Amino acid sequence: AFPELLDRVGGRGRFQLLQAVALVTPILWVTTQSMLENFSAAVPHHRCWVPLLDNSGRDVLLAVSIPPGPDQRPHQCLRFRQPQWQLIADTEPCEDGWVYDHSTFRSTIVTTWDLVCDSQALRPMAQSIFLAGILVGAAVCGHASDRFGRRRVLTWSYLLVSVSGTIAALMPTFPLYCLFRFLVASAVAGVMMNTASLLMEWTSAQAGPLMMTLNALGFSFGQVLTGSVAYGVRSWRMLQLAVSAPFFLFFVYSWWLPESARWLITVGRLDQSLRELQRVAAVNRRKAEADTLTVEVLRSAMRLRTFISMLCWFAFGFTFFGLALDLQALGSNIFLLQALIGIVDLPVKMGSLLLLSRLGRRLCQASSLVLPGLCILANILVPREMGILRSSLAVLGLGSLGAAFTCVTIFSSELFPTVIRMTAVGLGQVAARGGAMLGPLVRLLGVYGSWLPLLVYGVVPVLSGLAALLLP
Numbered sequence: 264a265f266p267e268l269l270d271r272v273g274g275r276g277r278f279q280l281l282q283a284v285a286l287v288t289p290i291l292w293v294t295t296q297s298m299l300e301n302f303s304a305a306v307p308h309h310r311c312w313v314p315l316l317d318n319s320g321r322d323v324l325l326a327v328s329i330p331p332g333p334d335q336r337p338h339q340c341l342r343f344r345q346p347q348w349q350l351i352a353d354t355e356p357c358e359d360g361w362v363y364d365h366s367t368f369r370s371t372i373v374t375t376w377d378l379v380c381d382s383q384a385l386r387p388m389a390q391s392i393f394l395a396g397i398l399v400g401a402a403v404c405g406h407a408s409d410r411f412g413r414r415r416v417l418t419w420s421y422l423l424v425s426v427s428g429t430i431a432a433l434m435p436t437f438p439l440y441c442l443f444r445f446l447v448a449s450a451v452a453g454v455m456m457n458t459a460s461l462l463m464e465w466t467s468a469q470a471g472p473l474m475m476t477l478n479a480l481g482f483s484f485g486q487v488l489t490g491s492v493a494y495g496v497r498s499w500r501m502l503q504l505a506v507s508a509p510f511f512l513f514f515v516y517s518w519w520l521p522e523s524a525r526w527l528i529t530v531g532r533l534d535q536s537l538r539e540l541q542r543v544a545a546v547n548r549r550k551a552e553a554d555t556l557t558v559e560v561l562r563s564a565m566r567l568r569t570f571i572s573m574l575c576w577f578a579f580g581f582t583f584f585g586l587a588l589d590l591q592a593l594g595s596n597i598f599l600l601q602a603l604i605g606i607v608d609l610p611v612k613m614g615s616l617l618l619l620s621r622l623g624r625r626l627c628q629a630s631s632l633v634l635p636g637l638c639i640l641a642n643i644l645v646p647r648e649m650g651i652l653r654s655s656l657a658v659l660g661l662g663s664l665g666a667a668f669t670c671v672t673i674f675s676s677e678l679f680p681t682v683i684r685m686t687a688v689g690l691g692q693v694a695a696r697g698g699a700m701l702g703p704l705v706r707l708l709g710v711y712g713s714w715l716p717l718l719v720y721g722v723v724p725v726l727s728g729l730a731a732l733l734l735p
């Protein structure tokens with residue numbers, strides 16, 4: 264009887280739009296917390312400290328103390344025991360600290376904790392930890408909202424994000440920074456899950472698509488904000504503070520939004536449900552049918568396809584969250600990137616969807632994985648002088664993976680007995696959040712050659728997409 268009550272109280276109108284506006288400004292700043300590791304953990308050019316240079320012909324002094332490296336650069340991990348003045352065999356690891364290049368970034372976490380050379384694996388692990396935190400928090404919060412309400416959990420998760428972010432920028436050692444970020448990730452996962460549930464709960468008939476696409480396009484405008492606030496704030500201790508502070512301001516105003524009116528009925532909190540419904544009626548201005556509500560009415564109210572879908576989400580997480588958290592290897596000008604991604608994404612997603620869906624439902628699913636995977640794979644062959652070509656195939660490569668998110672959120676999930684779709688979209692997101700933890704771990708394989716990470720990162724989407732043609 265709840266849909267009839269919702270029709271009696273509103274639908275579309277004013278409040279159902281104010282609520283949407285009030286819970287999407289925070290989803291731009293959840294994508295400034297996830298992809299900040301391209302600007303707060305960026306490896307600059309690091310050389311070895313020398314007593315000759317850098318105080319107790321600059322070019323000759325640099326050439327005599329540091330042996331030449333393989334990639335046409337001074338060595339980043341070794342120095343000469345004694346100035347080899349024979350240069351008009353014996354090398355010792357750096358023992359006086361590195362010297363970094365401060366020309367685009369002032370202080371990253373790499374600069375402050377020396378996560379270079381031998382201690383290199385720790386950098387692709389500080390992201391897998393965060394994704395594991397998101398995975399854990401998206402599973403714990405599921406069993407903590409059906410008993411504590413759907414609005415209180417969001418309000419407290421805002422405060423948790425704010426406090427954990429404001430604390431994580433003031434730690435003196437790596438292990439604690441790898442734990443407070445875990446807490447931030449769990450709270451962020453809770454925020455996203457509850458925002459989606461609240462967005463759908465209050466809306467009927469006009470929500471099947473529109474509502475769950477508004478969360479996914481808040482991410483695309485969020486990237487453009489990461490680029491901008493990093494063009495501006497350049498340090499790393501003043502970036503986490505500036506990103507985590509707005510969540511406290513969101514927490515204060517989050518005390519006025521009404522709670523879900525469908526959860527209040529199944530628990531017996533009829534009186535407050537009535538208060539919430541009448542309050543919503545006044546904002547919606549449809550104060551004509553609301554006189555009907557007199558407690559009693561609310562008292563009466565109180566396999567192959569499945570496997571194909573999971574593989575598709577796994578491939579989005581593995582490839583996107585591994586190749587996008589190192590946009591320093593897909594080209595240059597990191598600030599210009601992370602902003603063209605969303606601007607490409609929205610026109611690309613809309614235009615690709617409109618044209619391809621007319622071919623068929625399976626064709627759109629197939630062409631949204633093989634195309635970006637092949638675009639990424641065809642990036643190795645390009646020589647490192649057509650930057651427009653190497654960067655363009657990267658921008659368009661990563662942007663087109665963002666249309667797989669949409670073409671498997673609404674257009675798909677019908678490939679089942681078709682009762683209701685909130686059965687398997689949930690199980691799909693478990694895979695995508697678990698392929699992201701098994702994500703940047705592939706980037707640990709930069710040794711044994713450097714082409715292999717990109718090769719795997721392009722092959723996996725291609726095989727996953729080509730397996731979708733085997734539906735029967």
Ligand SMILES: O=C(O)CSc1nnc(Br)n1-c1ccc(C2CC2)c2ccccc12
Nearest residue numbers: 294297397479482483665668692695696699
């Ligand atoms: O929880 C989920 O949404 C399922 S996978 C996941 N886990 N953490 C995050 Br953030 N994401 C994310 C899932 C999907 C997107 C699509 C391209 C627009 C994201 C874009 C930017 C940052 C994170 C994203």
